[PDB]
Amino acid sequence: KIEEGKLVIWINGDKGYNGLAEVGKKFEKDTGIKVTVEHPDKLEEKFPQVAATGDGPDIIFWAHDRFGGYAQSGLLAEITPDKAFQDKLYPFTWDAVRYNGKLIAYPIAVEALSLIYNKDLLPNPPKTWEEIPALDKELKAKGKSALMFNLQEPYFTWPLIAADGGYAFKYENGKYDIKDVGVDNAGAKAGLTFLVDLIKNKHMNADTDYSIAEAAFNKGETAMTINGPWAWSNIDTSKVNYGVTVLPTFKGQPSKPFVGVLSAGINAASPNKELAKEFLENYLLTDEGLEAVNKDKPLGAVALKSYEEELVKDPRIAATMENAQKGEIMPNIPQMSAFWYAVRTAVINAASGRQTVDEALKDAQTYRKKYRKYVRSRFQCIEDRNARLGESVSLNKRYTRLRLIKESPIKMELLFDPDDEHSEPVHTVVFQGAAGIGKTILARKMMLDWASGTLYQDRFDYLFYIHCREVSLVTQRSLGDLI
Amino acid sequence: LSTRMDHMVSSFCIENCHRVESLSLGFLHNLTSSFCRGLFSVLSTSQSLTELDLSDNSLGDPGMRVLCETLQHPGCNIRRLWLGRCGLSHECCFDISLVLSSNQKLVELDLSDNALGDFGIRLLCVGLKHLLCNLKKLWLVSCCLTSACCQDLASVLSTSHSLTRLYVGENALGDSGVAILCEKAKNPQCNLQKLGLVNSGLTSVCCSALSSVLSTNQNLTHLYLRGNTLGDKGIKLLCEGLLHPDCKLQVLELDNCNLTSHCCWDLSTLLTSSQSLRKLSLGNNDLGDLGVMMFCEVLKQQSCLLQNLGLSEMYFNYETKSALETLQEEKPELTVVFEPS
Amino acid sequence: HECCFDISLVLSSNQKLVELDLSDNALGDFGIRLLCVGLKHLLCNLKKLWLVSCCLTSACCQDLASVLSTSHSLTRLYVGENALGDSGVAILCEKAKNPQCNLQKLGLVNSGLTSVCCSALSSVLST
Ligand SMILES: C[C@H](CCC(=O)NCCC[N+](C)(C)CCCS(=O)(=O)[O-])[C@H]1CC[C@H]2[C@@H]3[C@H](O)C[C@@H]4C[C@H](O)CC[C@]4(C)[C@H]3C[C@H](O)[C@]12C
Ligand SMILES: Nc1ncnc2c1ncn2[C@@H]1O[C@H](COP(=O)(O)OP(=O)(O)O)[C@@H](O)[C@H]1O
Ligand SMILES: CCc1nn(CC(=O)Nc2ccncn2)c(=O)c2cc3sccc3n12
B219 contacts chain A (CB < 8 A): no
Q: What are residue A87's phi and psi, to 5 degrees? A: -80, 0
Q: Is the dihedral of CA B97, B101, B106, B107 positive or negative?
A: positive
Residue pair A96/A261 in contact by the 8 Å Cβ criterion: yes
Chain B positions touching C34 (Cβ under 8 A) are 94
Angle between helices B291-298 and B263-273 (to 10 degrees): 10
Cα–Cα distance, A242 to A438 (Å, whole number): 72
Ligand 2 atom at minimal distance to the Cα of residue A439: 18
Q: Which of B34, B88, B94, B125 to mutate to test the interface with C (most CBs of C within 10 A)?
A: B94
Cα–Cα distance, C103 to C124 (Å, whole number): 10
Asked if the Cβ–Cβ distance from B119 to C30 is below 8 Å, we say no
Q: Which residues pair with B110 in a beta bridge?
A: B82, B139
Q: What is the dihedral of CA C78, C83, C88, C92, to 10 degrees?
A: -10
Residue pair A198/A204 in contact by the 8 Å Cβ criterion: yes
Q: Which residues pair with A225 in a beta bridge?
A: A116
Please report, as a single letter, which amino acid is at residue A27: F
SS3 B299: coil
Neighbours of chain A (3+ CB pairs under 8 A): B
Residue whose CA is at the smallest distance from ligand 3 atom 18: A434
Q: Is the dihedral of CA A343, A345, A348, A349 positive or negative?
A: negative
- C-alpha distances (whole Å) from A74 to each of A119, A164, A246, C56 are 49, 36, 38, 70
Cα–Cα distance, A18 to C1 (Å, whole number): 89
Residue pair B254/B310 in contact by the 8 Å Cβ criterion: yes
A178 contacts chain B (CB < 8 A): yes
Q: Is the beta carbon of A436 within 6 A of some atom in ligand 2?
A: yes
Count other Cβ atoms within 10 Å, centred on residue A223.
25
Chain C positions touching B125 (Cβ under 8 A) are none
B262 contacts chain A (CB < 8 A): yes
Q: What are residue B94's phi and psi, to 5 degrees? A: -60, -50
Ligand 1 atom at minimal distance to the Cα of residue A189: 18
Closest CA relative to residue B122, chosen from C54, C34, C14, C15: C34
DSSP conformation class of B205: G
Pick the ligand that lies closest to the CA of residue A184: 1
Cα–Cα distance, A27 to A383 (Å, whole number): 87
- Residues with Cβ within 8 Å of B58's Cβ and at least 6 positions away in sequence, in order, are B27, B31, B32, B86, B87
**What is the CA C92 to chain-centroid distance, rounded?**
8
- CB-based burial of residue A349 (10 Å sphere; 0-12 exposed, 13-18 middle, 19+ buried)? middle
Residue whose CA is at the smallest distance from ligand 2 atom 6: A438
Please report, as a single letter, which amino acid is at residue C105: K
DSSP letters for A157-192: THHHHGGGS--SEEE-SSSEEEEEETTSSHHHHHHH
Please report, as a single letter, which amino acid is at residue B136: K
Ligand 1 atom at minimal distance to the Cα of residue B261: 32
Cα–Cα distance, B170 to A357 (Å, whole number): 41
Ligand 3: residues within 6 Å at CB? A 434-436
SS3 B182: helix
Breaks (C-N over 2.5 A) in chain C follow: none
Cα–Cα distance, C81 to C98 (Å, whole number): 25
Pairing relation of β-strands A258-266 and A328-329?
parallel
Pick the ligand that lies closest to the CA of residue A439: 2
Residue whose CA is at the smallest distance from ligand 1 atom 39: A342
Chain B positions touching A340 (Cβ under 8 A) are 297
Cα–Cα distance, B275 to B95 (Å, whole number): 45
Cα–Cα distance, B252 to A305 (Å, whole number): 49
Buried-state track B12-43, b at ≥16 Cβ within 10 A, e below 16? eebeeeeeeeebebebeebbeeebbbebbebb
- CB-based burial of residue A81 (10 Å sphere; 0-12 exposed, 13-18 middle, 19+ buried)? middle
Number of A–B residue contacts, CB under 8 Å: 51
Asked if the Cβ–Cβ distance from B240 to A72 is below 8 Å, we say no
Chain B positions touching C30 (Cβ under 8 A) are 91, 94
Asked if the Cβ–Cβ distance from B294 to A362 is below 8 Å, we say no
- C-alpha distances (whole Å) from A65 to each of A61, A97, A98, A262, B110 are 12, 8, 10, 9, 50
Q: Which run of H or E residues covers position A83?
A: helix A83-86
Q: Which residues pair with A114 in a beta bridge?
A: A227
User: Helix count (H) and strand count (E) of chain B?
Assistant: 12, 10
Q: Which of B273, B274, B292, B316 to mutate to test the interface with A (most CBs of A within 10 A)?
A: B273
DSSP letters for B98-126: HHHHH-SS--EEE-TTSB--HHHHHHHHH
User: CA of C125 to nearest chain B CA: how many angstroms apart?
Assistant: 33
Residue pair A26/A283 in contact by the 8 Å Cβ criterion: yes
Please report, as a single letter, which amino acid is at residue B103: N
B273 contacts chain A (CB < 8 A): yes
Asked if the Cβ–Cβ distance from C30 to B123 is below 8 Å, we say no
Number of B–C residue contacts, CB under 8 Å: 8
DSSP letters for chain C: -HHHHHHHHHHHH-SS--EEE-TTS---HHHHHHHHHHHTSTT----EEE-TTS--BGGGHHHHHHHHHH-SS--EEE--SSB--HHHHHHHHHHHTSTT----EEE--SS---GGGHHHHHHHHH-
Q: Which of C8, C9, C27, C33 to mutate to test the interface with B (most CBs of B within 10 A)?
A: C33
- C-alpha distances (whole Å) from A398 to each of A294, A441, B126, B145 are 81, 11, 72, 55
Chain B, residues 302-341, CB within 8 A of chain A, namely: 302
C→B contacts (Cβ < 8 Å), by residue, are 2, 5, 30, 33-34
SS3 A265: strand
Cα–Cα distance, A244 to A242 (Å, whole number): 7
Neighbours of chain C (3+ CB pairs under 8 A): B
Cα–Cα distance, B147 to B125 (Å, whole number): 15
A touches B, CB cut-off 8 Å, minimum 3 pairs: yes
Asked if the Cβ–Cβ distance from A334 to B293 is below 8 Å, we say no
B→C contacts (Cβ < 8 Å), by residue, are 91, 94, 119, 122-123
SS3 B244: coil
User: CA of A142 to nearest chain B CA: how many angstroms apart?
Assistant: 43
* C-alpha angle A144-A145-A148 in degrees, rounded to nearest 5: 145
* Method used to solve the structure: cryo-EM
Dihedral-angle region of residue A239 (phi above 0 means left; psi in -120 to 50 means alpha; beta otherwise): left
Q: What are residue B58's phi and psi, to 5 degrees? A: -80, 110
- CB-based burial of residue B77 (10 Å sphere; 0-12 exposed, 13-18 middle, 19+ buried)? middle
Cα–Cα distance, B302 to B82 (Å, whole number): 42
Q: Which of B91, B96, B97, B123 to mutate to test the interface with C (most CBs of C within 10 A)?
A: B91
Chain A, residues 362-421, CB within 8 A of chain B, namely: 362-363, 366
| A437 annotated as belonging to a binding site for a ligand | yes
Closest CA relative to residue B303, chosen from A59, A338, A180: A338
Buried-state track B201-236, b at ≥16 Cβ within 10 A, e below 16? bbbbbbbbbbbbbbbbbeebbbbbbbbbebbbebbb
What is the experimental resolution, given in Å to one decimal place? 3.8
| A226 annotated as belonging to a binding site for a ligand | no
Cα–Cα distance, B39 to B11 (Å, whole number): 5
| Cα radius of gyration rounded to whole Å, chain A | 32
DSSP letters for A309-328: HHGGGSHHHHHHHHHHHHSE
Asked if the Cβ–Cβ distance from B298 to A342 is below 8 Å, we say no
Cα–Cα distance, B149 to B159 (Å, whole number): 16
* Longest CA–CA separation in chain C, Å: 41
Q: Which residues pair with B166 in a beta bridge?
A: B138, B195
Chain A positions touching B302 (Cβ under 8 A) are 48, 69, 73
- CB-based burial of residue B71 (10 Å sphere; 0-12 exposed, 13-18 middle, 19+ buried)? buried
What's the CA-to-centroid distance between A441 and ligand 2, angstroms? 5
Closest CA relative to residue B74, chosen from B49, B47, B54, B93: B47
SS3 B52: strand
Residue whose CA is at the smallest distance from ligand 1 atom 9: A184
Cα–Cα distance, B124 to B132 (Å, whole number): 14
3-state helix, strand, coil in chain A (%, to 5): 40, 15, 45
- CB-based burial of residue A472 (10 Å sphere; 0-12 exposed, 13-18 middle, 19+ buried)? exposed
Nearest to B301 among A334, A363, A366 (CB): A334
Q: Is the beta carbon of B288 within 6 A of some atom in ligand 1?
A: yes
Count other Cβ atoms within 10 Å, centred on residue A329.
23
* C-alpha angle B107-B108-B110 in degrees, rounded to nearest 5: 150
Residue pair A451/A372 in contact by the 8 Å Cβ criterion: yes
Closest CA relative to residue B26, chosen from B84, B101, B90, B104: B84
| A400 annotated as belonging to a binding site for a ligand | yes
- C-alpha distances (whole Å) from A66 to each of A44, A180, B132, B274, B302 are 8, 21, 53, 17, 11
Cα–Cα distance, B184 to B191 (Å, whole number): 11
Residue pair A205/A359 in contact by the 8 Å Cβ criterion: no
- Where are any strands of DSSP class E within A217-271? 224-227, 242-245, 258-266
The count of C-alpha atoms lying within 13 angstroms of the C-alpha of B68, restricted to the half-sphere facing its C-beta, is 22
Q: What are residue A263's phi and psi, to 5 degrees? A: -140, 160
